[PDB]
Amino acid sequence: GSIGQEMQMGDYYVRQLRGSAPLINDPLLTQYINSLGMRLVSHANSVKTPFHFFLINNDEINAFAFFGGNVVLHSALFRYSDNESQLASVMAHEISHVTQRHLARAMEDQWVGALGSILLAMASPMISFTQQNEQEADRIGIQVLQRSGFDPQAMPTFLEKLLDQARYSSRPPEILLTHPLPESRLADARNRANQMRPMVVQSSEDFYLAKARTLGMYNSGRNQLTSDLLDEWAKGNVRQQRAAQYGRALQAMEANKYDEARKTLQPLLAAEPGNAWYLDLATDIDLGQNKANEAINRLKNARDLRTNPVLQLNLANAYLQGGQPQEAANILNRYTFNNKDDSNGWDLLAQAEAALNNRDQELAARAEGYALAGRLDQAISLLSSASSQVKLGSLQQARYDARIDQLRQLQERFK
Amino acid sequence: SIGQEMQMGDYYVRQLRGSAPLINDPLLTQYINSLGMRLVSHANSVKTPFHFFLINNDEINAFAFFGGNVVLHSALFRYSDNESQLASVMAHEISHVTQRHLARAMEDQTWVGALGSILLAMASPQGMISFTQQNEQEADRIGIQVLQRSGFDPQAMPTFLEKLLDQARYSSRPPEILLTHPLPESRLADARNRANQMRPMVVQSSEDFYLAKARTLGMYNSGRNQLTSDLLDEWAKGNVRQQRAAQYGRALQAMEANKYDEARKTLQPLLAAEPGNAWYLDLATDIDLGQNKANEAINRLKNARDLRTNPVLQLNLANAYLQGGQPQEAANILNRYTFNNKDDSNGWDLLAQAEAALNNRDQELAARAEGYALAGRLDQAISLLSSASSQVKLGSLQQARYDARIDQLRQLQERF
Amino acid sequence: SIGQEMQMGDYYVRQLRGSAPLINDPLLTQYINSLGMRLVSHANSVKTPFHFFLINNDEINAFAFFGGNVVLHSALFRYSDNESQLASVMAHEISHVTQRHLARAMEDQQTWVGALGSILLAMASPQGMISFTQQNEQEADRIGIQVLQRSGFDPQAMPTFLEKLLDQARYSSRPPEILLTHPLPESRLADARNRANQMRPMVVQSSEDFYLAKARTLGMYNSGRNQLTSDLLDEWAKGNVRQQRAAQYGRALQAMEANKYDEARKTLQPLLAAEPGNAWYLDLATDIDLGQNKANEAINRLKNARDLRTNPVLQLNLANAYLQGGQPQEAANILNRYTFNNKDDSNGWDLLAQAEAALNNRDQELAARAEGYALAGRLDQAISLLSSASSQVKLGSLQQARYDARIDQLRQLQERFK
Ligand SMILES: [Zn+2]
Ligand SMILES: [Zn+2]
Ligand SMILES: [Zn+2]
C-alpha cells in the first residue's frame, strides 16, 4: 500500500541512480555492504520494507536514504571509518531515518522529479533534516548499532571526528549539510553512548579487506590507499595484517605488474584457499596474463561456488576469457534469474550470448541492463530488435513482446 | 464529424486485434463479411464502410461501434439454427450503427479509453454497454426490414428472440447478449407482429452457412464451442447441404487430430463433386502440408478456377509455396496480396516469412511492422520501420517509403 | 566359462560404478536399455543378458566386456543425428560380444584380470587402451548392420556415421577416441557402404524417445562439448513435430535447471496436456513442482498414472515426492518393494536410505547406504556400514543375523577377485 507506493517510488529513484551516478557494482564490495547493512536491519525496530545498500564512487563523504529502504553510501566512508563499528554507526543512522519515515513525513505534509533531481545531485560528484530528525536518528541508530554487536561509542567518536574536520577545513563535509551537526547533537550522542557499558569489538576481517579494495581498486581523488596506511596495517592485529598484503597485491595488479602481484598473493592464497576475497583476486591475476584455464580449475574446485554469487560471476567471466562462452551462458542464465537486480550478471550474459552468436538473446540481456538503469525507451528498443529476429508466434517472440509490455506499463506509472 | 468516428473506429479495432482473441481464418472472415455486406447492401442511410469481426468466445454476444465495425462472438454459430437467424443478429447490429445509437449515447457524455476498455472487456472471454428499450425497438424494426430486402426469412428474428428468451427467462444470470440487448416480452411481442405483417418467405440457408458453422465449431474449438458429434450425427440426416457439411466437419477434426490419411479419404467425395470450392480446396491443402506433400498442394491450387480472384486461395497457395521451399513465388503473390488487402494480418505475416526466407531483411522488417501496426502497437511498428529505413541508402526510394510510412504511423498516434 | 565371465563382468561394472561418472538417471538408463535390448532381441547366438551403461563423457567412445555389458559415452548423442546412427554403434558393440572378440583375444595370453579393469576405467573416465584387429571390426560391422535392420533402423546409418567420424578427424586435429578403440581404415568404410548398399532403402523416423533422450542428455547432463545449444533447439523447432516437442521439452528442462519454474511449467504445459501419461513429461512436471515446494500437487499427478505399478521411473519419482512431502513412511513402502525387485539399481537404495534417515531408523538407513557402496565396488566400506548397523540391534535378533549374513556375502565376494 503506502508501503507499495513508496517501494514503487524507491525503484524509480534507484533506476535513476544507476543511470547517472557512478555506483561501485563490485561483487565483493556490494556483498559486504549489504551483508553488514542487513545485520543492522535485523536488529532494528519497525522495519516494513526490504533494504538495499548502495555504494557511490565519490571521495566526498555523504550518506542518505529514500523510499523503499534504499540506503546510499559514498565510498569515502571507508576513508573516514577507522573501524567497522564507525561505518556501521552511519548506516544505523540512515536505517533509522527510514524506519522513522522522516523523508516520507516531510513530503506527505507538503515534485517527484524535483526530489529525484536532488538525489542524483547529492550522489554525483538539497535534502536537509531538522534537529529533531537527527536526534531521533542517532538514538534509534545507536540502539540498533549495539544490539548488532558493535561499539556504541563509535557513533559519537565518528560525529566528533566529523565536527573536528568541519571546523578547520575550508568547506564542511557534505554529509554535515544533509545531517547538520551542532555541538548539542554531539553532546546528546555522547550521553546515550556513555550510558551503556563499554564494548571493545574487533572489526571483521571482511571490513579491513573491503576498505583495502574500496580505496585500492576504486581509488578516486582523496580516496587513495596510501603507502602510509598499509605500512601502518602491517603492524596491526591479526586481521589487519593480511588485509595489508591483499591491498598490496591489488595495486601491483592495477599497475599491470602481475608478476609482482603473484608473489604478494602467494601466502594468503596458500593459507586461505576457500574464501572468496583472494579467490577473486586470484582470478584477475590469472586472466591478466592469459592463464584462464587454472583460474577456471581453481574456481571449479571451490566449495561455495554454488552458494556465493562472487565465485559464480568470477567463474562465469573466466569461462568467457577462456574461450568457453556456453559454460558462461549456463551459469548466467540462472544467475540473472536469481539476481534480477545485478547489472553485472546481465552484462556478462550479453557478452556470452554475443560470443555464441545468439543475437536476440544478447539484445535481450542488454535490455535488462538498460531497464535497471532507468533507460526504459532504450531497453524497449533492444527488445523490439530481438523480437524482429525470431519468428512470430514463437516462444521467444511472445517473451520479448511481453517484456516490452511490462517495461511500457512500468514507464507510464511515472510518465 | 464522420471522419473522426471512422478514425476512432480504426483505433478501437486496432486495440481489439491486439488483445481480444479475434478469429483470423480466411474462410470465416470472408463469409461473415460477405454475409454482412449483403445486409449493408440493403440498409438505409449508410454513411460509413462496414467490417465484421469474429471473436473466439463461447458466451453469446454482439455489439457495434463507430466506423461501422460489428463484433460477433463465435457462439452465435451454435445458437443460429439457420442462416436467417444469424443475419437477424447482424441486421440488428447494423441498425444500431445507422441510427448511431451508441454515438448519441456518447454525445451526452480519458473518455475514448474508458469506452475502449469496455469494448475490450466485452470481447474477451474474461461496466458493460447496454442499449435502451427505445434503441432496441428501433433496431428490431429497421433490422427486420434490412433482413427482408436481403432475401432471408423475416420470421427468423422472432424465432431467434423467442429461442433465447425461452432459455434465459428463468436464469438468475442470463447470457451477456441479453444484458447488452434487453429482451422483455414487450419487445418480443412487437418483433413477432411485424414479422407476421410482411410476407412469408421460406429460404434455405446457403451452403456456405453450414460449412462456416462446421469450421467455426470445428477448428476454433474452445469450451462450450465444441462441435459435438451430436450436431454432426443430426446433420448426417438433414438436407443435402447439411450432410456434406457434416462430412466436411469430421474431415476437419480428422485433420485436427493429425489423422491425415483419414481426412483425405473423408474429404474425398466432396472435393470430387465441387473441385473448385474454396472450403474443400482449403482443407485439402491443410491435409497435404501435414503429410509433407507440398508439391501436391501447390499443383492443386495452381489449377484452381478462381485462384486469380479469391483471397482464400491466394493465401493457401502462398503458404504452400513457403512450405514447398519456393519463397520467391510466395512473395510474388503476397506482395500483390498485401496491397490488395492492407488490413489483413495473415497476408502481412506470410510476406514477412517469405521475405525472411529470401533474406530481404528491410522488406521483412517492413512487413513485420504492418502486423504490429494493425494490432495497435504503433511504437513497435515505428521501431521496425526505423531499422528498415536504416538498411537502405540515404536518398534512396525505399528510404523515402519507410520514412513516409513512419510519418503516417506517428501521425496516427498523435490523434489519440 | 559363461559362469566365470558373467561374475567377472559384475566385478567390472562394480568398478565402473565406483570410479567412472555414470549417468544413473531413470529415464535415460531406461531408454538406452529399451533400445539396446531391442537390438539384442534381433541378434543371433546371444548367450548372455545385456546391460547398457551411459558415461557422462564428452569424448565419443563405446566398448563392451564380459557379461553382455556395453558402455556408451554420452557424447554419442551429440554425434547421432538420428536414432539409427545411435543403434548402429550399439549393434556394433553387441556384435563384439556375441563374437566374443574380447574373450577370445584374452584367451591367447593366459593379476591380468585387474590390468584389463584399469584399462576399462581409464577409457570410461574423462581424464593403455584396448583396440580391436581389422578382422574384429569387419565382423562387428557385417554382423551389426544385419542386427540393425532386423530391428527396423536405417542400414545406411552405419556407413553414414563412420564417415561422419572420419569427416571430423580431418577437420580437427583431434581424432575421436572411438576410432582409437575401433580403427576405421578406408577399407572398412568402403566395406560398410557395400553391405548397406546390398540391402534395401529404409526411411525410418526416429522414435520421439530418441529426441527427448538427446535433449535430456545434452541439457541436464551437459558437460564440455556436450551442450544443448540454442542452435540445436532452433533447428529442432524447425524440424518435424517430434523434434518440435523435444525442443519444447529441452527448453522447459533448461528453465527448470535455472529455477525458472513458472516459465518451465508454461513450457511443459502443452506437452503434458497432450499426453498426460508420458513419463518424460510426468518426470519433468515433478521436478518443477518440487522446486516450488509443491509436493502435494506432484504426488497427486503421479498417483493418476496408468503405469505406476509397471514403470520404474514413476515409482522413484513418486517415492522422492513423498520424501519432500513429509511422508517418508509412504516413500519407504515404495522403495522396500523397489529395492527388492531392482537389487542393482543404486537410485532405489539411496532414496530408501533417505527415507530410513527421515524415519529415524538408523540401522536400516546404514544397511541401505551399504548396498549403494556394494554396488559401487566399495565392499570394505559397505561391510563397515553393515557392521555398525549390526551393532545397534540386539544379539540373536533377526536383524542381527541378516546384517551379519550380508557381511558374509560381501566378504565372500571380496576373495573371489584378488
Ligand atoms: Zn541524519
Ligand atoms: Zn440491440
Ligand atoms: Zn569395433
CSV table of N, CA and C in Angstrom, one decimal, chain A residues 384 387-392 397 401 404-405 408, chain B residues 349 361 364-365 368 372 377 379-380 383-384 387:
chain,number,residue,atom,x,y,z
A,384,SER,N,12.7,-4.8,-29.1
A,384,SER,CA,12.0,-4.8,-30.4
A,384,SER,C,12.9,-5.4,-31.5
A,387,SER,N,12.8,-9.1,-30.8
A,387,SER,CA,11.5,-9.6,-31.3
A,387,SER,C,11.5,-9.7,-32.8
A,388,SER,N,12.3,-8.9,-33.5
A,388,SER,CA,12.2,-8.9,-35.0
A,388,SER,C,13.1,-9.9,-35.6
A,389,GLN,N,14.0,-10.6,-34.8
A,389,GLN,CA,14.9,-11.7,-35.4
A,389,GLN,C,14.4,-13.1,-35.0
A,390,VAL,N,13.2,-13.2,-34.4
A,390,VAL,CA,12.6,-14.5,-34.1
A,390,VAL,C,11.3,-14.5,-34.8
A,391,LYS,N,10.8,-15.8,-35.1
A,391,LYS,CA,9.5,-15.9,-35.8
A,391,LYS,C,8.3,-15.6,-35.0
A,392,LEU,N,7.4,-14.9,-35.6
A,392,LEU,CA,6.1,-14.5,-34.9
A,392,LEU,C,5.4,-15.8,-34.5
A,397,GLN,N,9.3,-14.8,-29.3
A,397,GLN,CA,8.6,-13.6,-29.7
A,397,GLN,C,7.6,-13.2,-28.6
A,401,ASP,N,7.9,-9.7,-26.5
A,401,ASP,CA,6.8,-8.7,-26.6
A,401,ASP,C,6.2,-8.5,-25.2
A,404,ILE,N,8.4,-6.2,-23.3
A,404,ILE,CA,8.2,-4.8,-23.8
A,404,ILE,C,6.9,-4.2,-23.1
A,405,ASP,N,5.9,-5.0,-23.0
A,405,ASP,CA,4.6,-4.6,-22.3
A,405,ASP,C,4.9,-4.2,-20.9
A,408,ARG,N,6.7,-1.0,-20.7
A,408,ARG,CA,5.8,0.1,-21.0
A,408,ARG,C,4.8,0.4,-19.9
B,349,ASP,N,1.9,-11.3,-42.3
B,349,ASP,CA,2.8,-12.2,-41.6
B,349,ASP,C,3.4,-13.2,-42.6
B,361,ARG,N,16.0,-8.3,-45.7
B,361,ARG,CA,15.7,-8.0,-44.2
B,361,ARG,C,14.9,-6.7,-44.1
B,364,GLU,N,11.5,-7.6,-44.9
B,364,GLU,CA,10.9,-8.4,-43.8
B,364,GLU,C,10.5,-7.5,-42.7
B,365,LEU,N,11.4,-6.6,-42.2
B,365,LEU,CA,11.0,-5.7,-41.1
B,365,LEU,C,9.8,-4.8,-41.5
B,368,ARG,N,6.8,-7.0,-41.1
B,368,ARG,CA,6.5,-7.2,-39.7
B,368,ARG,C,5.9,-6.0,-39.0
B,372,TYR,N,2.4,-5.4,-36.6
B,372,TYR,CA,2.3,-4.7,-35.3
B,372,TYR,C,1.5,-3.4,-35.3
B,377,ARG,N,0.1,-1.7,-31.8
B,377,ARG,CA,1.4,-1.5,-31.3
B,377,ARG,C,2.2,-0.6,-32.2
B,379,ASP,N,4.2,2.1,-31.7
B,379,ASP,CA,5.6,2.3,-31.4
B,379,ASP,C,6.5,1.2,-31.9
B,380,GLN,N,6.1,0.0,-31.7
B,380,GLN,CA,6.9,-1.2,-32.1
B,380,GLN,C,7.0,-1.2,-33.7
B,383,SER,N,9.4,1.3,-34.7
B,383,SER,CA,10.7,0.9,-34.5
B,383,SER,C,11.3,0.0,-35.6
B,384,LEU,N,10.4,-1.0,-36.1
B,384,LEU,CA,10.9,-1.9,-37.1
B,384,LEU,C,11.1,-1.1,-38.4
B,387,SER,N,14.5,0.6,-38.3
B,387,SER,CA,15.5,-0.3,-38.7
B,387,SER,C,15.6,-0.6,-40.2
